[PDB]
Symmetry: C3
Subunit: 114 residues, 3 copies
């Protein structure tokens, strides 16, 4: 799976260890081995949410399965909780888009997961 | 909804008020309150369109509904017009990908919209 | 079509000619004219793959058609090969998400391709 967070919070406000915390928390939440979790954090972005440039985040989670109504509610509480605690972003200033990928549409290691 | 524009135009060429203009114009275009609109502009990118690194843009619009044939043509005219007027990017050097998100796949405020 | 590569490799390690090579190889691979191929490379990113910050890449290819099981295996071999040769990223530290876009959902030049 792949998790991306884009935020206007400055880089120095991203704690050391945040990428590893995302990796391990998402490995547990998706049930997949951590070796398959990729995480990407993009701070210092020029962004606005509802017109305001207070701290906000736009995120995505792509996974081959493990995506659905109840699962995404659970991921949203987990991820909003992490963004609030670690980056000080209010949960009502976060959007997370969830993508259930077909294995044939995810390339890796010269091939795909199909 | 969420609108992202990635461009090779330099940061200093992005006018004051650009995020705000996008927020209110996308609010009008989607018919949604400005408080729902998130916008993200990424200047100074290493990008090419047709092999040329003249000014160009790669963009996305994600919305729960309000995405379709005629609607997307109207969004493209609006957004290309803004990129041309404000960033001086030719419309034939802009791509915008449109995504009609299911409410269950959009997380916000510790939950989703399902 | 559009191809985006996000990587933690530093900008100085992206060789001259890289965007052009991507443009030309993707035109050839997809069968589409090079004038319509857009490419975007994002170095210096804060990213991990499997929990490690060794060089890695997260990429996407969006195309109106020319996406499918065998085609995507072929694109992955091509694109991982380029990333290994030019950016010195191991193919097993690359993900590429593939998107078969409907023409109505790709904006360009004040309209869409529908
Ligand atoms: C086609 O179907 C749908 C299409 C679109 C949507 C979306 C899009 C989204 O972006 C969105 C949003 O951003 C905020 C939003 O807010 C309100 O939803 C009501 C109930 O709807 C209340 O419960 C309020 O509490 C109210 O919640 C808040 O108002 C916010 C602006 C504040 O930040 C927050 O603190 C609280 O004051 C509702 C939203 O709806 C949902 C759908 O089902
Ligand atoms: Cl996955
Ligand atoms: Cl970190
Ligand atoms: Cl942890
Ligand atoms: Cl599953
Ligand atoms: Cl579920
Ligand atoms: Cl898919
Ligand atoms: Cl996109
Ligand atoms: Cl919406
Ligand atoms: Cl969706
Ligand atoms: Cl295409
Ligand atoms: Cl992607
Ligand atoms: Cl195929
Ligand atoms: Cl589509």
């Amino acid at each position: 799976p792949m998790f991306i967070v884009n935020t206007n919070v400055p880089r120095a406000s991203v704690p050391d260890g945040f990428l590893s915390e995302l990796t391990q928390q998402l490995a547990q939440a998706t049930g997949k081995p951590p070796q398959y979790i990729a995480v990407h954090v993009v701070p210092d972005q020029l962004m606005a949410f509802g017109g305001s440039s207070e701290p906000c985040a736009l995120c995505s989670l792509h996974s081959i399965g493990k995506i659905g109504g109840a699962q995404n509610r659970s991921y949203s509480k987990l991820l909003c909780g992490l963004l609030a605690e670690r980056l000080r972003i209010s949960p009502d200033r976060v959007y997370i888009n969830y993508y259930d990928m077909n294995a044939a549409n995810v390339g890796w290691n010269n091939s795909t997961f199909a």
